[PDB]
Design a protein around this nucleic acid. Structure first.
Length: 49
DNA sequence: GCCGCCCTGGAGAATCCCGGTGCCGAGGCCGCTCAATTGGTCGTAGACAGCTCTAGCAACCGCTTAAACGCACGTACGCGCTGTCCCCCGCGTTTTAACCGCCAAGGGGATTACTTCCTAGTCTCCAGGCACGTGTCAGATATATACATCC
């Protein structure tokens, strides 16, 4: 069963794939986003934001 | 009538202020002058691309087991109080040497300019030392088997 993505999933996917550390931080107080293992973060974004 | 004592006024000298002129610190100007700038040439340091192989990383598993953690108890030590005595501090007095200003000549060392030559950079060629891989060999280790012996 192939299902589409939400808007949050799509914006997280384009933020990870076109790396946007300033945009990926946004409202986070810590701001510690790790983009080592890009494809694992892509799978995490495809599963749940 | 003559002589001595108290009260009050104007002129001579000291002081504050201002102007003209000379001296100290600093900045503008000028002159030398050597090092930064400009322009041109060329070699190569590094950026870029490409392929191969190994380490790291996120997130999960499973097993073991030793380290971590929590708790209770107990007692040793940190800490506070008190005494005591001794040694350091404050002060007065006396000494003394640091400090500054002086010879007296001479050598050491910093510059400026010059000469010379030995030695280290550079280039070319070559060979052997270092790094890596492997065959072989002697010392260390484990067991197979035979002989003396106690029950």
């Amino acid at each position: 069963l192939r299902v589409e993505l939400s808007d949050v999933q799509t914006e997280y996917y384009k933020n990870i794939l076109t790396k946007n550390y300033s945009a990926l931080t946004a409202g986070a107080k810590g701001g510690h986003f790790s983009l080592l293992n890009i494809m694992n973060e892509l799978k995490k974004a495809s599963n749940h934001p």
